[PDB]
Amino acid sequence: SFHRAFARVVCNYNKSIEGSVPWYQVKREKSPFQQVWDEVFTPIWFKLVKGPYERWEYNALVARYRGMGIMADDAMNDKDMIVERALDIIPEDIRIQRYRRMMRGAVLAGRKLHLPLELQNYDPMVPYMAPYIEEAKFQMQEEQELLAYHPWDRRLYTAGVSGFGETSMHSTFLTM
């Protein structure tokens, strides 16, 4: 049987790379060719194209946030699961101000108005969600590894759920 031979090859290979250091954790020296490219192309490209374009986009983004009176981390959409899991655990004082800022922004945007300049002198790029995003990613990675390492077989279209993995009832068209 060829599947048995293939299974042994996979087992032996994976056993031979256990404990390997990830590529990013290796101390890597650039090749003599990438160093030349960085010496010539990268400086000129930054001065003439990348630097000005990205400053132009960044400064516009800061202005847009300041006009709405929101922070950058407010702009995250909770349809993303990491954001939703992080928002479950944020403390109440952070939550209250986040909601108020987001509500004011939508009112301003909907009515085509901008925040008064008196209230615009703040840094919008303060990363207040970072501790909770990292905790949420850790929780999700543990669940991924210890509980979702195989494609599981379940009885199909039973109890309001397709049986293909989703956990909410009536959350697909074929489960109406």
Added chain:
Amino acid sequence: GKSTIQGTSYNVVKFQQEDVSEVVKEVPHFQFYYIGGEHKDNKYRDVPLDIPVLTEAPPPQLKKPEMKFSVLENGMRIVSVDKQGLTSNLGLFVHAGSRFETPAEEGLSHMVECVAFRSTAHLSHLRTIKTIEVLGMNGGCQAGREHIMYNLELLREYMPVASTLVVGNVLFPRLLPWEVNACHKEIKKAHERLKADTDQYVSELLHQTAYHNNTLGNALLANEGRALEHFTGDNIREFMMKHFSAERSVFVGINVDHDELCKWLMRSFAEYVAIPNLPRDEAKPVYTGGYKLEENADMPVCNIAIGFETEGWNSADLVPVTVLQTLLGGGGSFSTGGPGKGMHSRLYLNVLNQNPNVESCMAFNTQYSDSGLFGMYITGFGQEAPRLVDIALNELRKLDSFTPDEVSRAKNTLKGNIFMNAENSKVLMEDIGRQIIMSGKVVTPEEFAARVDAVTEADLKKVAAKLLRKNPTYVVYGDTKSAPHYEYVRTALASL
């Protein structure tokens, strides 16, 4: 023996600095993923089980089990027995039960049990419980009145992993706010579990009434109302800093090599600091007696208990009172015991055989470090309560004298119970841990047998006389609408 702690001598285990690379070689080998594999047909697929297939088995190596005692430099005591079984029973006992709670700290001991095996410094909640599950281990945490126990049952080859997981509960638990809040569910489940066991539920009513609003009367379980205000990670951490310390903790292992167990426990505390030991208020229990009538609208039967204070486990009356319990014995209609199963105890002969209306009559005896309760527990139909109490009181008045045959039968049955209970490993683990926490010493089953043989009728009379002078504790549970009043019981016993 290098150190004597509370009357017992222990061998001091020195901390050693070991590189993580070296220790990793000794960790038991196991996998969580099986990515591929080498196919191999079952070689015994055609061999019936009646045909032996194993040959050249190494000769067995049998050693008489002995209990060994050791202690770490941080003060954690280690007691293990190796019966050469294939399953280990690891147990961590901490001297922090409900009795040490202040009224503002009500239920914190139970809360600690509820947050057990949650996230620690070096492991997540999910990873801890999935590791316990994948390795086939079972266990949990139970908070008592004087101690809290963490226990795991496992194949002995995985002892290094199990000991690490248990210790992490008291070494560096992360009492994260959201994890703790998820444990509020367990309080309602704990109440349901307690109330389901009628015998245990009546026992808790006894202790609350016997010791009014003090050490041994503190509720074992936290309530689900105002107590949830301080069911917080911060509050639990403050409670643990008061009571949890290496000096108040004992690690017990059954069916584990002592040197290996000591080595791995040492490696767990080598580079970390345990909770420092601080003085705490330890007040003797105050016995008040009293009564409580607890209605259960669903139950048609009446459960009655009459109890008296005993000096406790550390007294010289421990064995004579225990013999008194076996002499009176008891039983119930539910069961039909064969020979040697209490059919000739005094309660069985004088109550069950002569009163068809009595559903069950037994003698209970709870022992703690410095106090205990002894009494009779009798059940029946609600309307029978006035007669059930009279039967119980009449038996209490017969404890003035005992026949020689009854004393000998009681002594022999007690010795049989001691030896037969000991052979259960989980029982032996819990017995050792509780004894050290209560007394700092372990009395072996054989030594208890020697004491039992020395009990005379004079000792039984003396102990019974002392019990009957205490103010009775009178609990009625179930259908209480016909039970006599408390003053009736006290006047009946006032003569004694």
Added chain:
Amino acid sequence: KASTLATGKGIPGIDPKLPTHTPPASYDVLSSGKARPVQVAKWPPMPGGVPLPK
């Protein structure tokens, strides 16, 4: 200088205590305790970061 919020306290760059950028610092040992492996390249990197089989 950067004594008060008006003077620039807490503004990266203007405030001496706060750097303009926060790049991670280099390390010589992995968190496991293994020595960090070293790889000196002599050819340009793969187009997609594709690793070669062992």
Added chain:
Amino acid sequence: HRPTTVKMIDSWRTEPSSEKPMWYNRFDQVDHISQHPDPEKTEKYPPVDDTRKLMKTRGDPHIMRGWGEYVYCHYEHLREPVFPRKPDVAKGELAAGANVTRTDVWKRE
């Protein structure tokens, strides 16, 4: 939840957040959350009258590189290594997630 997916993978070209944070890695640590300052009662920066006088931002415009549409954000979905880089909390770097659990930064003396 409805059928959903996250890009929690091991990229071949992009490092994880533990290796290279994209946010300004300077945080203040307290012993209890109540020790943090209260923003409502904390004075903010002095208001300006010209849009050209507004303060500077801490974000790095060129945090990300390579082909693709420009974007500035602080977070990604990538998986972390079981032995993540030890954060420098002494300088203010944030320690949350794997860099706390699977490291010994939390250990004091």
Added chain:
Amino acid sequence: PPIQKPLLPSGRAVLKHGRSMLCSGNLSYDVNSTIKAPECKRGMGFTQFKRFTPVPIESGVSVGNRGWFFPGVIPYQGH
């Protein structure tokens, strides 16, 4: 070989609160014992089907709540 214990391990303490190995009676047949051998009124064998958890069954009690609902609230179409 025969299996003498239920497939679901108890995981609880064998001894009751305040009762030790000395004063617990005989755990083999005592009524309050958690490890007493069941009585074979109808014969030996049914312990393979038996539920050893002392708590009575509460039909329909929820264990599939992931935190999406408060107690007493009825989900409607899963949401």
